[PDB]
Design an enzyme around this catalytic site. Sequence first.
Site, PDB file in Angstrom:
ATOM      1  N   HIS B 365       0.745  -1.225  -0.110  1.00 39.70           N
ATOM      2  CA  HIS B 365      -0.004  -0.009  -0.059  1.00 39.70           C
ATOM      3  C   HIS B 365       0.700   1.288  -0.146  1.00 39.70           C
ATOM      4  O   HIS B 365       0.160   2.341   0.101  1.00 39.70           O
ATOM      5  CB  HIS B 365      -0.956   0.026   1.282  1.00 39.70           C
ATOM      6  CG  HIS B 365      -2.051  -1.031   1.193  1.00 39.70           C
ATOM      7  ND1 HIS B 365      -3.391  -0.980   0.636  1.00 39.70           N
ATOM      8  CD2 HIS B 365      -1.928  -2.503   1.731  1.00 39.70           C
ATOM      9  CE1 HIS B 365      -4.133  -1.970   0.908  1.00 39.70           C
ATOM     10  NE2 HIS B 365      -3.285  -2.877   1.482  1.00 39.70           N
ATOM     11  N   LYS B 556      -8.809  13.799   4.701  1.00 35.36           N
ATOM     12  CA  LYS B 556      -8.057  12.723   4.633  1.00 35.36           C
ATOM     13  C   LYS B 556      -7.066  12.742   5.860  1.00 35.36           C
ATOM     14  O   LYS B 556      -7.120  13.575   6.476  1.00 35.36           O
ATOM     15  CB  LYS B 556      -7.120  12.427   3.289  1.00 35.36           C
ATOM     16  CG  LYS B 556      -5.967  13.709   3.257  1.00 35.36           C
ATOM     17  CD  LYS B 556      -6.372  14.477   1.962  1.00 35.36           C
ATOM     18  CE  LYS B 556      -5.636  13.699   0.752  1.00 35.36           C
ATOM     19  NZ  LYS B 556      -6.817  12.776  -0.055  1.00 35.36           N
ATOM     20  N   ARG B 557      -6.354  11.528   6.417  1.00 34.23           N
ATOM     21  CA  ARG B 557      -5.513  11.753   7.434  1.00 34.23           C
ATOM     22  C   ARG B 557      -4.505  12.965   7.185  1.00 34.23           C
ATOM     23  O   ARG B 557      -4.175  13.198   6.145  1.00 34.23           O
ATOM     24  CB  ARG B 557      -4.793  10.558   7.634  1.00 34.23           C
ATOM     25  CG  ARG B 557      -5.720   9.392   8.243  1.00 34.23           C
ATOM     26  CD  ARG B 557      -6.212   9.669   9.440  1.00 34.23           C
ATOM     27  NE  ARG B 557      -5.030   9.638  10.212  1.00 34.23           N
ATOM     28  CZ  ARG B 557      -5.011   8.757  11.434  1.00 34.23           C
ATOM     29  NH1 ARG B 557      -5.318   7.586  11.398  1.00 34.23           N
ATOM     30  NH2 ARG B 557      -3.763   9.216  12.111  1.00 34.23           N
ATOM     31  N   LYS B 668     -14.087   8.661  -4.553  1.00 32.24           N
ATOM     32  CA  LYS B 668     -15.487   9.125  -3.784  1.00 32.24           C
ATOM     33  C   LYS B 668     -16.030  10.222  -4.308  1.00 32.24           C
ATOM     34  O   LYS B 668     -17.296  10.519  -4.575  1.00 32.24           O
ATOM     35  CB  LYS B 668     -15.291   9.023  -2.268  1.00 32.24           C
ATOM     36  CG  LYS B 668     -14.946   7.704  -1.607  1.00 32.24           C
ATOM     37  CD  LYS B 668     -14.648   7.796  -0.074  1.00 32.24           C
ATOM     38  CE  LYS B 668     -13.542   6.445   0.037  1.00 32.24           C
ATOM     39  NZ  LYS B 668     -13.375   6.913   1.361  1.00 32.24           N
TER      40      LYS B 668
END
Lengths: 830, 830
Positions: B365, B556-557, B668
């Site tokens: 990832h 997002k983070r 998204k």
Amino acid sequence: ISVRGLAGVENVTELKKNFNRHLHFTLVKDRNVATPRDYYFALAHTVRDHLVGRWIRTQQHYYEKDPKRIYYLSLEFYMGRTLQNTMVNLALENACDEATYQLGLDMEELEEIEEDAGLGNGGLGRLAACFLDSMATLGLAAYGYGIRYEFGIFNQKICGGWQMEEADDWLRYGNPWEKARPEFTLPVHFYGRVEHTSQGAKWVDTQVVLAMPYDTPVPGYRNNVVNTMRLWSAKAPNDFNLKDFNVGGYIQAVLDRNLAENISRVLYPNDNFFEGKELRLKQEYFVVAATLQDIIRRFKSSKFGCRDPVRTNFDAFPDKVAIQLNDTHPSLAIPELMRVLVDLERLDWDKAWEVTVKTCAYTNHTVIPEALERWPVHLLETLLPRHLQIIYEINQRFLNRVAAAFPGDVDRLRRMSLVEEGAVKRINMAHLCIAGSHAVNGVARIHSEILKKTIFKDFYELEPHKFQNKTNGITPRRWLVLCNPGLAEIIAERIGEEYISDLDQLRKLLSYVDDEAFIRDVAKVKQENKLKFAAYLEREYKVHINPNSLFDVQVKRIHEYKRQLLNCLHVITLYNRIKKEPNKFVVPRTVMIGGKAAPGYHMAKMIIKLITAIGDVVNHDPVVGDRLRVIFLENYRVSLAEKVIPAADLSEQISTAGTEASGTGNMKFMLNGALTIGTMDGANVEMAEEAGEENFFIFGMRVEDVDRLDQRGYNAQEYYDRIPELRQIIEQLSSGFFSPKQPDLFKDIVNMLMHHDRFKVFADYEEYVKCQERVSALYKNPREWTRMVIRNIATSGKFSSDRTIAQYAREIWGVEPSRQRLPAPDEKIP
Amino acid sequence: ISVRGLAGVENVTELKKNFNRHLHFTLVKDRNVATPRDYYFALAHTVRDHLVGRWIRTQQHYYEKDPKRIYYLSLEFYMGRTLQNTMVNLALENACDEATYQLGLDMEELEEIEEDAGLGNGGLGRLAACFLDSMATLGLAAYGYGIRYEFGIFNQKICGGWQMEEADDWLRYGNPWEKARPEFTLPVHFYGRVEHTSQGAKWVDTQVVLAMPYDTPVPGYRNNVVNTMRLWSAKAPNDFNLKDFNVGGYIQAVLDRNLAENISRVLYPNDNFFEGKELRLKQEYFVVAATLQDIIRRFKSSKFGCRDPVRTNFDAFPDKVAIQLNDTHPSLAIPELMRVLVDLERLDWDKAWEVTVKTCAYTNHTVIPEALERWPVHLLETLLPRHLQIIYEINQRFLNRVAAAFPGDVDRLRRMSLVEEGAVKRINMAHLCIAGSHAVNGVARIHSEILKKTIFKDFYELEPHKFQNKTNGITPRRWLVLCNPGLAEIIAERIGEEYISDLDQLRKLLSYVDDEAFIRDVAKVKQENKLKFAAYLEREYKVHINPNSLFDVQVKRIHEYKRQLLNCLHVITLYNRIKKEPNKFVVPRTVMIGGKAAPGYHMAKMIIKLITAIGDVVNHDPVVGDRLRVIFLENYRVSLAEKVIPAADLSEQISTAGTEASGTGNMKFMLNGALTIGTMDGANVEMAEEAGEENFFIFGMRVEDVDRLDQRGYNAQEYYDRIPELRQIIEQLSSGFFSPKQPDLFKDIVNMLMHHDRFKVFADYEEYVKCQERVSALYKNPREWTRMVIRNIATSGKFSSDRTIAQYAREIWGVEPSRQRLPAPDEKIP
Ligand SMILES: *Cc1c(COP(=O)(O)O)cnc(C)c1O
Ligand SMILES: *Cc1c(COP(=O)(O)O)cnc(C)c1O
Ligand SMILES: O=P(O)(O)OC[C@H]1O[C@H](O)C[C@@H](O)[C@@H]1O
Ligand SMILES: O=P(O)(O)OC[C@H]1O[C@H](O)C[C@@H](O)[C@@H]1O
């Protein structure tokens, strides 16, 4: 099948589909993978469904009518399994038996899967459970309040003859009876300090632990009343238990939550012994602090939280509330109630005190000094600063009362103080309870008298009106109908069913004492019970017993005062006599001794080892044969008690006169067809008085003889010198006859017996074996034994907890019991 | 009402009585005391009832047919709420909406009460949740396996502009979706040592922790398939965790159980960052050890646990099992599978290895070094002795393979080793996964190429066949139908409903790109969504925004590589330009930045403070008016994402080229009607390629430019020197313009930006604001903006997780997806 209710056509069908609904929808299983455990849960959920309707209306009812509420505070509630008991009280047992049968399952086999709710140690915790059942059956608006420990009394394992303790994870598979109520979570404070500002003191900078309640239903016996037992669980706040910032670690902060939650993790396994640990003191304040907020909230609503005089007048508090202290464990309720009334509600001291004394009542359970709660002041000082201040102030005013009543009696002043000086200052919790309660009671007539004559003499002279007596009792439902349906049925065949909630009616059985059929029946059920137990023994524990022998059993916690040791001396005597004249006939006996020893009680654990040691010798001696067997009943608990008591012939209640406050196991045996061999101690006196001393096997010293001996000075050597049989036993223990590989294994027991026996075992030895000979003589005459049994059973009615509760209700709580059926369970949805 | 299904007559009636059944029987409440929370639980239990029937038959089905099973191992499963999603997949939404309406309740209001299942950090955890939904929808016999943390990702609180962390007690009120399965509890070993005796090694003297499973249903989309997500909980054995005797304290022993159970207490809040803590390593072995036993048990039964060749031949294991590694977290599954096969099942090494490599597959990832798992050998040595031995042996054989392939390439040998030498020896978990897996995949085309060209170049040269790519995707169900029913409806009005499980069909919307009614509608739903969010904002967080402005959002983070800082520089630029020419017109914007920072990530927390600091200045400048607002979206999580994304106009995906593996938030936003401004990074490239670069706002360096700059050497001063606007901003930060009371508050940010910017923020600044001007220009032309939106939506079909899963299925797992409806849910009780 029995009078376990009707097995209706419509209801057996209804039960079965609901059993299947749950197995599918609740358990999410399908018949091909369901195990006995899944089946037990489907049934449990099906049975629980039948009392939610009644639970809701009972509670709604109390809200409408608003009667005086009874709050029973106790750190222990020895509940046991609840499936069968619920079926019994709801008259669902036969229907469930039928339905499960048609589903092709054995109900009895599924019942055995339910884990015991062992949130108690012994007598005190079981009394609370019996009281809850009786209070519901008498229709009192009563609530049981305690702590929901996730680990109850440990499960006992015998390894190499020694007791091994292991965690009782009774919640492992879940509890279908409780209902978590996170929405009524309350905050409880600890530590902090006291700020005295302008208008009042303030408890400040405290650590907060949350109290989450879990409600368990308590159904009355066939009256549609379902009361509530609310157990608190500790939970850490998400904030400060994370939010008190500036380095430490985020992970560690989350892991450390299990520090505030350790408060409700485990029950202290001490029976009649005080351990001044901080964790204990925290548990005691936690249950008290949370419970009181719940009590006041309900009061603020009542009919005052609508109108009435209008002005939160706590003058009516005592008219609406009654809180009962089960021993001194919840004693902080007194200063806590004052703290709230004075600090938060702002009532003047005197008005607050009046309210407090009037709503509280204390029950004492023992007179032994080591069981007395004396908390070091430095502990209360650190953990509950404001409560210490209140206690000192209560003490100040009380002592002033004493000084005014007994002018110049300076010793009386120090003797009565709630504060004890010495090595470390301590707070005498019992003195606190007497001062802040309007009623103080003993649990048996002799115990109650002893309190007045001895331990609390000064207090009795000050306020004689406070002291009362309320002889304990047991619930005839779980302790007769549930564990002994066979005996209950034959009784019902003759006198009906009304005695289950009116035990006094057992007296009517006196007229069948010469009835040939009854004698035969009473004798038959006892035989069937013994056979079933003997079987269970080989089933679950493995190694045979003889059902024709006399079943001699002593089951209770292991204590020096209970004298399991005296029982041991007799057992060894029997053995030695048999070895002396092998071919002489003696009545066969299976003596069963069971009980748990507190983990730190060295002597108690030494006694368990002695019992198994005797068994190793006795049970493998070929000359003895089947005439004598010594068995140690492992993991004695409520569910095990429901099996042994109905199968007992002889009940052993042999504590030293004046040490056992009351006892309740004794009563359990009397109602179940066992004869009693005991001392004039606790309730034993009232039992022999009720059945007639001729129908009881009484021996040993009375209280007076014990005291005469103490004046004199107890010397065990005298007895050792004058009784050869006694001497022979002691020298057997000393030489390793019972412990070959470790000859000095039992030196502590011998040493203690000879030099520091606080309970003078030797002193009652001669009269004890002489008396045991008399019971053996009577056992040889079946017809007469059974007739004496009938005399005990027919006369045990006074020992029902319904009688005890009715007395508490009338003479302490000021409420009237009622055997009125609540208006059905019927649907309804407002 | 929409196509949330039919609101049938029979079913709305059925729903209502079941809602009432639960409110009464399950919740034990009565309408007069029920709160919105009770109502939510009654509904939740009612909805859960509808999928147990299907859950049971789906599982029974797999047992009968016995197909290849897919096991998805992941330490994270970012699930979110599950009530609505279940209604959607079961076509129950309208019926429930109707029924609850008739009961007089607002469903939407009850949905808001459900707690998020935040068992994830960000991308990786959400991918796993989207995959589960897709695997069920494609009818794969798949199982999600993980850890049931009792504390998920922390809840973020902003205090004084700073992030405050607080425990996420998501289980406080209970979880109606899970089903505890204590009966399938398994033991997991830790520590101990290795004994080499005669026939094999033995892992001995280990500490045992039990793994108790909890099953949660995963329903496919309208096909009647309900798969299982099994989460493990740590539990202490009752024995040794009490039974290892000889003083310590009985109480303490019981309290210490919360030491073995701390394994599943909390999720590590690290996103793309590796922390070598022991607790983490324990969590990793725990999920792996327990899961594998479950996998083999199911295999031993299959059709081999009946007959087949007869002889537990694990040769068919890979034909029946497929285990997917979500990153390197569950990498111990490789040596653990070998341990079992070799040590316990006694297969020869080579046969065992063949089976292992053939059933395992690894998904990478990220490429940033600090995110790479390199466990110190002393840790593995102490905690998992036998696994270390196996890893060394795997390494030995693998390196021999390399030596044989590249003779004399000694550097390649050390580079490829699973063991890294240096300060402390470590084990490179990624190298372990590549060696013991038959397939290694990237999560986006460019990321996959980078792995082959860079990070795993040597491994790719060795076995080129292992490396693949599987571009991520999201589930159109939760990320469209569920969060944006308005958009889903208008799409369905034109092209039908088949696109929900066949997103490619969205392409058909291309032919409505000039349709006047559609353009108006697409524009209308976006306006309605913005209005609803603007409202929610004032409702739950309080202080107004303007719904007519452009909604600029980056959620997002918080990371340095995501460059929230670059977003900040633009925001300050906008402000400064407005302050320079106040009476000049500029397109109004509401820029929303949201995300969580790992507790120990100092820079990330400094960035959150900067964002709020900018807002304090900008939002209270009267000259700015409503033209510019800076808002920090608090506690960004799944449920919050379902609210902001549908209301967004501009999506910010501005990471430094080559750092964001793929990203999923980007997708998204694309499917929900937002235009994207971003860099050619991760999946952004495939998205622009799918929609056409003309319909995308691409700017900044490409990977190649970044590398050119690194060769050269990145000097931020150059940019500071040549861009006055940039200079002006940096000097504003340095002088306290944004932090008056603490002028040097942001010295770390400035210092870093100028001297140690690993993600060259300044380098993309000019092209970033130039590009932002272009989006503002297009926003001024509503019709054209909407038309470009239609081009993105109509072209986002490739980004559905159904496509991703179908590829994993075919190219890695060797199974065939199927959109076949399982044979109804219909009753049945065998
Ligand atoms: C009734 C009971 C007791 C109390 O027994 P005593 O003989 O009064 O000490 C203790 N434990 C259990 C399991 C009981 O049922
Ligand atoms: C989709 C999602 C993510 C991933 O966002 P990226 O922009 O790919 O980092 C993170 N958190 C939540 C709440 C999500 O829904
Ligand atoms: O309001 P209090 O008396 O605390 O609790 C009352 C509640 O008790 C039980 O949980 C049953 C429930 O039906 C009832 O509503
Ligand atoms: O036997 P395994 O596949 O572990 O579990 C199968 C079980 O899964 C779920 O808990 C649903 C239940 O109906 C089924 O019986």
